[PDB]
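User: C-alpha cells for this complex, please. No commentary.
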Amino acid sequence: DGVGNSSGNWHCDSQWLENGVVTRTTRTWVLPSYNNHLYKRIQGPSGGDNNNKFFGFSTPWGYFDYNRFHCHFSPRDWQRLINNNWGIRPKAMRFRLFNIQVKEVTVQDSNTTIANNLTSTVQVFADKDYQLPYVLGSATEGTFPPFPADIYTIPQYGYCTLNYNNEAVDRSAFYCLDYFPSDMLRTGNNFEFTYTFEDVPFHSMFAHNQTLDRLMNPLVDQYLWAFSSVSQAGSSGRALHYSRATKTNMAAQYRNWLPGPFFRDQQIFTGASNITKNNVFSVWEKGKQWELDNRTNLMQPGPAAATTFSGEPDRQAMQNTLAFSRTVYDQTTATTDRNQILITNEDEIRPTNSVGIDAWGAVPTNNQSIVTPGTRAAVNNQGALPGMVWQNRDIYLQGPIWAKIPDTDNHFHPSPLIGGFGCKHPPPQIFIKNTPVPANPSETFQTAKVASFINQYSTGQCTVEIFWELKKETSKRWNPEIQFTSNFGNAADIQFAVSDTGSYSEPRPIGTRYLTKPL
Amino acid sequence: DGVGNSSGNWHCDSQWLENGVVTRTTRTWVLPSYNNHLYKRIQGPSGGDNNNKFFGFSTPWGYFDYNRFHCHFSPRDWQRLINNNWGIRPKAMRFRLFNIQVKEVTVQDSNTTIANNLTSTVQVFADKDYQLPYVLGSATEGTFPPFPADIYTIPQYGYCTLNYNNEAVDRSAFYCLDYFPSDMLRTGNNFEFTYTFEDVPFHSMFAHNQTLDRLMNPLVDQYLWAFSSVSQAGSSGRALHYSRATKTNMAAQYRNWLPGPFFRDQQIFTGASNITKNNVFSVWEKGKQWELDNRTNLMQPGPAAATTFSGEPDRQAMQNTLAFSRTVYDQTTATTDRNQILITNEDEIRPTNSVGIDAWGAVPTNNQSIVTPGTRAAVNNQGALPGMVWQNRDIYLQGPIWAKIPDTDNHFHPSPLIGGFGCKHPPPQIFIKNTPVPANPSETFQTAKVASFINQYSTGQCTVEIFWELKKETSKRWNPEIQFTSNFGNAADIQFAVSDTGSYSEPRPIGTRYLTKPL
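Assistant:
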C-alpha cells in the first residue's frame, strides 16, 4: 500500500486446542548487506589436516532459521505441553514478513547518520522445490531468540559443495540465488506463504514403566527348556544339563526382544568426587568416530543410548548427551565449568536402550572342544538384528525441531541423530536480500564493474505460526508421576526470566519425557 | 491511510442527557523509549527494614492511566453534577488513539535534531482478560492532566510479584508484554476499542438529614421497658429498677441500628490555636496499621469515619482524610504548610459513621457480683455486627474513579477504601510501545545481542469517552440546601484557571455530597 500504513500486526500468543496447539510468534529482524553484494568463494583452512577442509560459496543473501523449540514455545507452554501429553508432531506452518523499512547509512567525520530510503526494496523467496543446499538441518547459530523482545540478526547464507580437500572437483555446483524468481518488497509491501508438514511419527513424550527384559510375569516360571551346562560324568565322560528358567532366575530366560542398535562410547567421571578418576585424554583420540572419503569425523550424537547406569549418575557417556548454552548470545566457544552450560540427560530411554558405557553383549568366537576351550568377545558396535526395539533421543526446548532427510536411494529409520523430526520435504528455506542501490556513475560510459553502492540495511517483523498435533495420555497408573516443576526456592532472579541487566537466560534444560507408559 | 491524512478529530466536550452524561476528553501524549527496549529486574532497597522491600520487573512499555475524575469532568461540569444529583455510576467507555507520529532524535556536538520517521511503528493492545498485573487501582502519578491544553507523558509500566524480601520466591511470575498480540500502527493508522462497565452501585452524592440515633419520634415515648439500675434496699438487700425510655431520655432507648464497622485512629490539632496542643510523634509510631506476611503497613484511608466532632473542626482524625496537590506537576514529596495542598473533609458521613477519634463503644469485661464490681473497656476496633449501616468515603474531583476487586474466594463490601467504584472487571489496561528500530549491523554475522537502536519517541492524541448514569433527586425539603459555590470574592487569579505563567491550578477540593436525604 503506502509508507504510512502498517503491513501487519504483532502476534506472539499460543492457544491450546483439543488434540493440538498453535504457537504463533513474532520477531524484529535486521538484515545486513553481506559481501558488498558479491558471491564469493569461501574455502577451508590451508594445512595438513584434511578433516576441516571444505569448498563452497558465500552469497549476498540471508535466511530465516527459526528451527529450535524455544523460538515457538515459552517455558510455561512447554511445561504445559510435556506434562499432559504423550506425543507431539508439527502439522502446518504459516510464515509472513511485513513492516519492511530500509535504512541508508552515511559515515562522515567518524559520525554515522541513518536515514530511511523510501524507494529501496527487499527481495524474498522461499525455496519450495529444495533446489538449493539445505543448511537448516545442521544445528547452527542464527536462530530466533527465545525471548520475544530480543531482535534477530539474519545470518548470511553460504554452502559447501563436493570437494577434493580445498580445491573443487568437477561435479561441484555453483548456485546463484539471483537466478531464482523473487518478490521485491518496498515499505508498503508484505510477504506471506503457508506450508504443511508431511506425515511424521509423533515424538514420544513418555518414558517406560518397564524394562525390556522384565516384561515377564514374576510369579510363574517358563515352560521352555534350554541348555544349561556341560559337566564331567566319571573320568572322561560328559553330561549335558538342561534347565527351565524360573521366576528366581530371570537372567537366563527366553525373550522375544532385544535392545536397539548400539555403538559404544567412552565414559567420563562427571562429579566432584569422581572428577579425579578421569585419565587425561581428548575426544578426538579416545572417542568414537566415523569416516567418509579421506576425512574422519567424530560421531557426535550417535545412535541414542542411556547416558549412565542406574544409581551411578556421576559416571556417564561422553559422546551422547547434548549440551546447550544458557544464553543465545554467549561468545565463548570453549569452557571448563559446567555451570555455564546446560547438559542433557538421556536416562529415560534406559529401559529399551542399552547404556553407552558398557558393551552391547558378547559373542562366542570359536568352536569349542576338549582341545580348545570356547572363547567369547564383547560386542562394542551392533547393527540391526531382527527383534530390536529402541527409543529416539528426545527433543528439548532448546534443541532443533527438524532436519531434511537426504535424497538417497536408501534410508534406515531416518530419525535425526540430534533429535526432532526427519522430513523428506522440510519447511522451505526463506532467503532475503537487500537489492543493491549503486552510487552515482561516472557520467561517461565505462566498462569497469560497479563496486560502489549505497550502504544500507533493512529491518522489520516476521511472524511464524505452527500448528502442532498432540497425542493425549490414557493411563490407569494409580500413583502420581514425575512432572517438570520449577524449584529454585529463593533466588535473586527467577528462572527463565530476564536479569537486572535485561538479559534473558534459561537456567536448565527441559526434555519432553516425564509421563510414563507400560512397555 | 496515509501520512497526509488525519486519523481523528479533537473531541473534548461533555453533553448532558436525561438520566446521564457523556464526558469525552482528548489529550496529546508523548511516549519515551523506556529501558532501551529491555525488560529489567527492579528490586527493593537493600537494608534492614523489610517493609519497603519488593521484587518485580520494569518493561519497555507504557500505559494510559486516565483514572481520576478531573480528567473527564471540568470544574463546572462537576459543580453542575454534584448539586443536582443524588448518584452517579459509569456505564460505558470508548477509548481511541490516533494521529500517531514517531520522531527520530540524533545528538551531535551537543545539538539535538528531531526529524520524523515515517515508516516506524507504534504497537498498542488492551488487556481484556486481566492476565497482567493491574497497576491502575493504586492511586499513582501518570494520569491525564486535568487541563486539556497540557500534554500527557505516558508512564512506564512495571509490576511487583510475590517475594521474600528482595529476592524472589518460587511462585513469582514474569510477564512478557511482547508475548501478547498487538496492533502495529504507523502514522496513518489508528486504534480504538469500546468497553462497558459491570453493574456497580451508584455512589451516593447526598448527605443525611437525620442522625442514626435520632430516627425516633421526639413527641412520644417508648413502650419498651428496660433494666435501669440496681439499688440497695435496706442493709444487705437489693432492688432491680426498670424504666421506659421517654422523649426526655433518648440516650437510653431501643434502636434497630448501629454504626458501621470501625477502626479507630489518632487525632491531630489542625488549627492555629490548637496547633500547640500536639504531642511530638510520627504516624509510623502512633498511627493505625495492618500487617501482612513479615511486613507492616500503615492503614492509610481505612474504613470511612467522620473526621471530626460537630463544632470542633480544628481537632480531627489524622489517618482518614485524603489530601491532594493543587497542581499535578509539583515535585515536592513532603511539605510543612497546608496551604500548598488540598485536604478533604469527611464530615458528611457523620450521621451514620462514628467519628474516627473517639471509640466505637464499650463492652462489659466481667461478670459482676457483690464481691467483684463490674468492669468495662472501650471498643477501639469493631468488625461487622448484625444491624450495621455505613457510608462510603465520597469521590472527589481529584480522586480515583475505580479499582479492581482482587480475584479471591471472598469479598466483604468491596468498596475501594480510597474511593470510587470497585470492579470485578475494570476498564482494561492499555499498553503502548515504540517498536525498536536497530542501528546498522556489522555487515559480517555476529552472535552478540543488539544493543544499538535508533533513538526515537512518538506522540499523538488519545480520546476517552465515558457515559455516566445519574440518579435524579426527589425531595420535599422546604428550605434551601448547601450547594457548591465558588467564592473567592476579589482575587488576582480566578480559581480553577491558569495563572499569568500559564500554570493550571485547583484551589480547593470538591466532594460530591451536598444534597441531603432523610435517613
